[model samples]
Target: LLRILKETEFKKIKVLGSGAFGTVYKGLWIPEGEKVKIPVAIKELREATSPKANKEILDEAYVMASVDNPGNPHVCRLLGICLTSTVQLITQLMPFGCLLDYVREHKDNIGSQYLLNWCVQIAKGMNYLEDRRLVHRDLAARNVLVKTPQHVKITDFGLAKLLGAEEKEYHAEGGKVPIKWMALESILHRIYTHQSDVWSYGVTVWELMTFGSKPYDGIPASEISSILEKGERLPQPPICTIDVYMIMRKCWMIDADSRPKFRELIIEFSKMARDPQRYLVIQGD
Candidate 1:
């Protein structure tokens, strides 16, 4: 069962990171009588007053709790949540930081092996969600954290949704969206699905290739819809190989049904990871 922690249980040390809704802090849990402090990451909600806003923050905690699995290495683990003045979610700290920052910082030293591992691990996390019939509405590089150069975990489920048989898509009420990384259907009709997540995964791959470069660079969000509607796709990053680019293209297919599921993508990624040298050579193709 998910339970709230007492405010006195943990002491904030320093700020780790922050996003639109909350600020993450590095903290320590000091149990009574002992001098030892267990390190943890605490995410405190920034502005959660209205019932609707409050529910959104609670939903993030619920989703994180529901998907809690010790076996899944790619999903971030939740420690507990506390609610006093505002809600705070506690989880394990990934010292390496977010995937986007890592790729950009280590661009010179990182290799294809690490990139493929990150992609596969991300797919595994998404597959776990897919198995549970949930949609990670916001799936991007910034939402993932790296434990090591070869290991990563999916984080931030504030925008996650549980899917019902009748509701494969969801219409947005009113919220800012990542237009460039969004699927065409999601952008136009506000219809989100697991396949839509697959679309964002393609953009995430592009980000990996470009080392955190913004997707659809130089293109404003206002014009992205019109541009995409005209069949214009993002230019291939210089470092992206043909095989991986083909997978990315499949993910970005205009029709949502055409996109490969995370399960299928994981199989392809596994193959690539197994025989990187074989796939790297594209002599006759």
Candidate 2:
């Protein structure tokens, strides 16, 4: 359940980051004891009419509340909410920063297996969401946070959609699509499905292998539709193995039904988790 909080209960220390949905602040939450201050991320809505703002904020809260189990290791936890003066949603603080930044900064020091572990975690999280019939419209490296090394959680559900009965795809009327990470159908028809998230997951795998390099490098957004329709897909990263690259390619199939679901991806990663070196082992050694 969402908790009603007072503005005095927490102090927004500094602006941590900003996005289309809102700005996140590094805040200090004062408990009932009034003795200790705990760190929290306070996400404040950008701008909206009072009613629309509350509805959107509460909608997000409802999504968060639906998966309120602390035992779940993959999804980010929503701690509380403050709808008094300004709409503020409180969540646990991810001190290590986002997955993309962590990969970029630690790639030289981290092992390839560890990077793969992060992918596995992301897969598990998405799988959990999938089981719940929710589609994370935006699933990118930036939306994942490194709770700890080898431990990551999914966040940024501003575009998430809970599928209605008998719905296969959620058609978005207007919004800026992340062209490079989006599926062909999503870009061409504004259709978002679990398979669309799969496409982004493949790009995320590329992001992991390339230490956070941008997808479709040197290609403009305007040309993505034309280029993709011509059967072009992202080139495999230098570090991506043939097996993993094949999986990534499977994700990029033009037909949404042809894409691998999170469950299939999880099973593939589980095999790697057992013995990563077996698949990527050197022949000459």
Candidate 3:
């Protein structure tokens, strides 16, 4: 079930980000009953080139809808869907753009408070997914959109999994993988759990601290296993304080169970945000 709309209901304003399910847009929603022009995001399907493409695009729409069906503050809202010659997902507009680009553009002027707040928002968003027994296989800064320095909405639920009691773990066999953002266990076993997502959350946090630098830069994917097996991990982002990096280290734990849960992440982070001076002191490990 989807809130289906028409392509005519929207008036394109500017390109938000090209390459969606391909092509994302920042546009205006002209509701017939209301005279207000509501800004929205339209994520277009690569093309209705085939029935298979339509099915996949529809599946993604269902996933995004199910996740936000009850409404979530940190997840992007699904306003409606457009089925014309092709498919497009119309969602609430996040004018600030994706987190990766936002941080990169403002890193020089942004302060630690706003930087840390992004982490909290992400943790809260992931916690919402975690509560519903959902696992976001792809958790990275690039997948999150910014509304403000203090506000963000998690996007791109294409690889998300809704698990059953018996299906706590799952595997995706033989395909392109996000190797750099992956956990050691995920890389070695080709399996994924909510814990594996926690691993990527750590990597994402590193990207925030490093102002969107690519993880494991200059290191080939094939070499990741060797380095990880040798007990190496992503180095601490030079600008992050020990307290912040400490959370990331815990997330990258070799044994997944050793990592903290999403709920714990909120508790630990909220404490620091409440009293920054006492918690976020700059220092060496």
Candidate 4:
């Protein structure tokens, strides 16, 4: 059901990656009668999807389309939809790939400037989502998209939803859970909310600083779940700075109410990103 965007729409580019649900093609979109080509992440649904699933996907796109945050990476404008069913969603494109790919290409060059900068950008995105009373549900390094220097965007809203919804009524894969980046209480309680997302922000921070190390990747998923259930957290990544580490710890605190709100986080980040030049250098005792 793909409505062909004009032959001009599919500007020749490379295919970047694929998934069980869809495939990502790197293409340049030259809107009809426009001279310039906009870089986009062209996603094709490989399978059919249900109306409920399709609407939810559309719901995310609609939310993102109306999101007008400067700090947030530009979401696809939802130029058009070819076909949607229980299996697939062909979406607008993202040319910059994702944070995971970027880290893989430049992990060794990672420095404080990059880390702090990305943290602020990511925080900005998360704060924006929180402002709208939304939760990405699956915030991870791979889900964040970077378009240019210091420009960050979040992708994969298929797993996104408003917080405080009934948890049990919605179960995927016969109760297979999303890769949770929350505290023990959240995991065991089966509660996905704004606080749980904050917990995820901590792991994303670690991922950004360490250049995309998977959160809790060293242990089996089951063991990690048990560890979280026991009120434990993943060890701090190496080279984590003191201030950033402190913020992460605050995010992981068991009391969700005690966690800092996005506004506070924004203020705190203003302090950290103040001297962008200084953060680039590795500090030591």
RMSD of 1: 4.4
Better of 3 and 4 by lDDT: 3
Question: Judged by lDDT against the true structure, how good is candidate 3?
Answer: 0.75
- Candidate 3 is scored at a TM of 0.84
TM-score of each: 0.86, 0.86, 0.84, 0.78
Per-model C-alpha lDDT, please? 0.77, 0.77, 0.75, 0.62
Question: Which stretches of candidate 1 lie above 4 Å from their native place?
Answer: 30-36, 53-60, 69-71, 158-175, 277-285
Q: Estimate, for each residue in 62-87, the C-alpha lDDT of model 2 and write its tens digit.
A: 76766755335978877777886556
> What's the distance in Å from true for residue 198, model 3?
0.6
lDDT of 2 at 86: 59
Give the residue spans of candidate 4 off by over 4 A.
1-13, 28-39, 49-60, 68-79, 84-95, 161-170, 174-176, 275-285
Error of 3 at 68 (Å): 2.3
Q: Over 4 Å off in model 2, which ranges?
A: 31-36, 49-53, 84-86, 158-175, 278-285
Error of 3 at 192 (Å): 2.1
User: Which residue pairs collide in model 2, if any?
Assistant: none
